[PDB]
């Protein structure tokens, strides 16, 4: 599912993101917007064996189990998989032990080169929320 | 299959160093993020703080700085330090994952001269 | 920091009855609220995640709702081993922080 700007914005706000840890809803849905264009099926593989998951790519070798990546932890005990679907819930349950960590969000790059400390706020405002 | 047992001695005196272990099993010390909780005799709960995978700690502030949090990934455990107990640091410590899927059976120290 | 209020402090029904416990934040917390149970000083045990969010392996009679600053947690038809403390817990903001919790206890 490929979710509009402001839908999703209203989903993650719903999920609990807005000024979780201290971060604005603005911050979550401009990484949303750079990680996959706002498209839950988003899958990106890399070199070390290890595949990003979902509207926030999610690491495999890190965060979520597949199955088939080498050095696999699954920090956020989840298959894979359930970064994936049209309900965000999974991914946001992860999203938020990853923020949970010193590194904060600065664990997406794309957040850090396009949403950090910019006005995430144009991301929100607009919508009805 | 992850179960956890924390481990120490019972009695701390005033002024002292409170210590106690972890011992995690059925997954790796680097496999989640860990956590320390608190039950005082009045039954309250207070969550002392967790070590999250890159090491960083997180630390209630009213335990000011008394508080430390470590891990040795070779014995697969996580520790508590609490410094200067009083009497009033008497409860029975609790280590949990921060999933809150899992936590130890709890353990008593008594802060006592 | 973020205070977290339940009501009432103790409920006494008996068993077969449906009940609803109380957790008010000082803050909104949006659904970063937890749910705890602990049959003494006994380990605690999650029963509900963010709110509503169901947990494998946890019977179906326990359920949560709200959002915000208020949430509920709901026990349809308590069974003789519900009896115990229940506590909700934020992960909102550090430091997290816990409820004074409710003591369900038998009524006769």
């Known amino acids: 599912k490929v979710f509009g700007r402001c839908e999703l914005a209203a989903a993650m706000k719903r999920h609990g993101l807005d000024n979780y840890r201290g971060y604005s809803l603005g911050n979550w849905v401009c990484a949303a917007k750079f990680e996959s264009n706002f498209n839950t099926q988003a899958t990106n593989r890399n070199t070390d064996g290890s595949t990003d998951y979902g509207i926030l790519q999610i690491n495999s070798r890190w965060w979520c189990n597949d199955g088939r990546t080498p050095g696999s932890r699954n920090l956020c005990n989840i298959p894979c998989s359930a970064l994936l679907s049209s309900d965000i819930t999974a991914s946001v349950n992860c999203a938020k032990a990853i923020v949970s960590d010193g590194n904060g969000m600065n664990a997406w790059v794309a957040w850090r080169n396009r949403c950090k400390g910019t006005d995430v706020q144009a991301w929100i405002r607009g919508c009805r929320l | 299959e992850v179960q956890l047992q924390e481990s120490g001695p019972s009695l701390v005196k005033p002024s002292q160093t409170l210590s106690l272990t972890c011992s995690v099993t059925?997954?790796?010390?680097?496999?989640?993020?860990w956590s320390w909780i608190r039950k005082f005799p009045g039954n309250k709960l207070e969550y002392m703080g967790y070590?999250?995978?890159?090491?960083?700690?997180y630390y209630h502030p009213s335990l000011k700085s008394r508080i430390s949090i470590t891990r040795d990934t070779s014995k697969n455990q996580y520790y508590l330090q609490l410094n200067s107990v009083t009497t009033e640091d008497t409860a029975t410590y609790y280590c949990?994952?921060?999933?809150?899927?899992?936590w130890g059976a709890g353990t008593t120290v008594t802060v006592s001269s | 920091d973020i205070v977290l209020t339940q009501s009432p402090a103790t409920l006494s029904v008996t068993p077969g009855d449906s009940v609803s416990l109380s957790c008010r934040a000082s803050?909104?917390?949006?659904?970063?609220l937890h749910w705890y149970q602990q049959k003494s000083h006994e380990s605690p045990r999650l029963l509900i995640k963010?709110?509503?969010q169901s947990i494998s392996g946890i019977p179906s009679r326990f359920s949560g709702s709200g959002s915000g600053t208020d949430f509920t947690l709901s026990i349809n038809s308590v069974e003789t081993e519900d009896f115990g403390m229940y506590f909700c817990?934020?992960?909102?903001?550090?430091?997290?922080?816990f409820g004074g919790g409710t003591k369900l206890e038998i009524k006769r």
């Open positions: 949990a994952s921060w999933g809150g899927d899992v």
């Open positions: 059925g997954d790796s010390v680097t496999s989640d993020y």
């Open positions: 070590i999250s995978y890159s090491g960083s700690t």
């Open positions: 803050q909104s917390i949006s659904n970063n």
């Open positions: 963010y709110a509503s």
């Open positions: 817990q934020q992960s909102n903001s550090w430091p997290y922080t």
